[PDB]
Amino acid sequence: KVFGRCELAAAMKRHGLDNYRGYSLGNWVCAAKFESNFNTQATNRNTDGSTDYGILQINSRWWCNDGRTPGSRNLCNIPCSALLSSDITASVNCAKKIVSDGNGMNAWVAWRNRCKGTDVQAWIRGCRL
Ligand SMILES: [Cl-]
Ligand SMILES: [Cl-]
Ligand code: NA
Ligand SMILES: [Xe]
Ligand SMILES: [Xe]
Ligand SMILES: [Xe]
């Protein structure tokens, strides 16, 4: 499923991401934009063999199981395919664990390089939330 900008903002807010760990909603929407362009079915193969899944491109190296990432972990205790669902519950719950890991949203390199420090509020402007 490809979410609309404001549609995703609303879904993320309902799931408790707005200001989670101190990160305003705009930060999450901005991260999703550059990680997946709002597409829940987005996937990407990393150089080390791991794969990124979903709207927040969560990696199989530590967070989910895809059965093809040697020596990896599944800290979110979920099959990576769950991160591709039209229902973002799994992605949100796992994202909450990731952002609480110690480095905040810097865990998402795209957020650090393209969202961090910018006017992320623009990503939710005009949205009825
Ligand atoms: Cl594996
Ligand atoms: Cl932080
Ligand atoms: Na894994
Ligand atoms: Xe992929
Ligand atoms: Xe998400
Ligand atoms: Xe909403």
Distance set, CA 89 to CA 14, 82, 85, 93 (Å): 10, 9, 9, 6
Q: What angle do CA 96, 45, 93 make, to 5 degrees?
A: 15
State if residue 8 touches ligand 5 by the CB under 6 angstroms criterion. Answer: no
The active-site residue out of 7, 18, 48, 52 is 52
How far apart (Å, rounded) are the C-alpha atoms in residues 57 and 106? 13
State if residue 40 touches ligand 5 by the CB under 6 angstroms criterion. Answer: no
81: CB partners within 8 A, 6+ apart:
53, 66
Chain centre distance of CA 87:
13
Chain centre distance of CA 128:
21
How far apart (Å, rounded) are the C-alpha atoms in residues 108 and 110? 5
Q: What angle do CA 12, 16, 22 make, to 5 degrees?
A: 100
Cβ proximity of 106 and 86 under 8 Å = no
How far is the centre of ligand 3, averaged over its atoms, from the C-alpha of 126 (Å)?
Answer: 38
How far is the centre of ligand 3, averaged over its atoms, from the C-alpha of 42 (Å)?
Answer: 17
Q: What angle do CA 74, 75, 77 make, to 5 degrees?
A: 65
State if residue 91 touches ligand 5 by the CB under 6 angstroms criterion. Answer: yes
- Establish whether 101 is an annotated binding residue: yes
**Experimental method, per PDB record:** X-ray
State if residue 45 touches ligand 4 by the CB under 6 angstroms criterion. Answer: yes
Which of 76, 40, 77 has its CA nearest to residue 56? 40
CB-count burial class (<10 Å; 0-12, 13-18, 19+) for 128: exposed
How far apart (Å, rounded) are the C-alpha atoms in residues 57 and 41? 10
Nearest ligand atom owner, CA of 41: 4
Residues in the chain: 129
Return the CATH fold of 1-129: Lysozyme (1.10.530)
3-state secondary structure the chain: CECCHHHHHHHHHHCCCCCECCECHHHHHHHHHHHHCCECCCEEECCCCCEEECCCCEECCCCCECCCCCCCCCCCCCEHHHHHCCCCHHHHHHHHHHHCCCCHHHHCHHHHHHCCCCCHHHHHCCCCC
Which of 38, 46, 88 has its CA nearest to residue 66? 46
Beta-ladder partners of 23: 20
For residue 38, what are its two tokens? Answer: 């709002």
How far is the centre of ligand 3, averaged over its atoms, from the C-alpha of 129 (Å)?
Answer: 34
**Residue at 52: amino acid letter:** D
